[PDB]
Structure 1
Amino acid sequence: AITARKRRPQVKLTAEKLLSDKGLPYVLKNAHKRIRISSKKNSYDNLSNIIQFYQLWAHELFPKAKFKDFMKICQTVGKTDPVLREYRVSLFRDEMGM
């Protein structure tokens, strides 16, 4: 019966999006393929070989945030969300189930 009034929306990294296909399943699809670590390279380069993939994945998943801030958000949702816990424990449960 009433004409609308606008209110500002907001978006944040929900655990559902973190569990979308481009979320952690993307990590499982691509991390072991893309990160490579070797004695043939120094420690700084090996650390960079990790960080480059996780940064690109983080930006492609949630481009809004800086990489460190994204990491804090990920650590904190990891500290809290039950479905994310069930997923992570399911990963190590699958490794147990091998």
Structure 2
Amino acid sequence: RRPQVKLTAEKLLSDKGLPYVLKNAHKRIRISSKKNSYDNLSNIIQFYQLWAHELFPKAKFKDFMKICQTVGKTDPVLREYRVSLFRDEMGM
């Protein structure tokens, strides 16, 4: 009767998602030599889990990562953009 919510390229490419990550990802995340490795890993996973929950509350963190892997493998439009970001850096 109702199509299942699914992590499509459209949601990822929306303002919330990859654009949000590129906007503010280095400022919030911070790996410090003084702090232990566990704390830095916790901080990184803390940022990414919050972003995923804001974007895709449906799936847990590990499931979100696996779905992201599959989508990146499949979707061509996602590949287009992923190549594009790298291309801009080569330009820079």
TM over 0.5: same fold?
yes
What secondary structure, in the 3-state scheme, does the structure 1 residue paired with 2:26 have?
helix
C-alpha RMSD of the superposition: 0.8
Give the greater-gyration-radius structure (CA). 1
Structure 1 runs (4+) greater than 3 angstroms displaced: none
Gaps of 5+ in 1: 1-6
| Alignment pair present for 1:18 and 2:12 | yes
Gaps of 5+ in 2: none
Q: Could you say which structure has the greater relative contact order, defined with CA pairs below 8 angstroms and 6 or more residues apart?
A: 2
What secondary structure, in the 3-state scheme, does the structure 1 residue paired with 2:34 have?
coil
Q: 2:83 aligns with which of 84, 89, 93?
A: 89
Q: CA deviation at 1:8?
A: 2.8
Q: CA deviation at 1:81?
A: 0.8
Name the CA distance, whole Å, in 1 between partners of 2:44 and 2:10: 24
Report the TM-score when normalising by structure 1. 0.90
Name the CA distance, whole Å, in 2 between partners of 1:8 and 1:88: 31
Name the CA distance, whole Å, in 1 between partners of 2:4 and 2:70: 19
Name the CA distance, whole Å, in 2 between partners of 1:71 and 1:28: 17
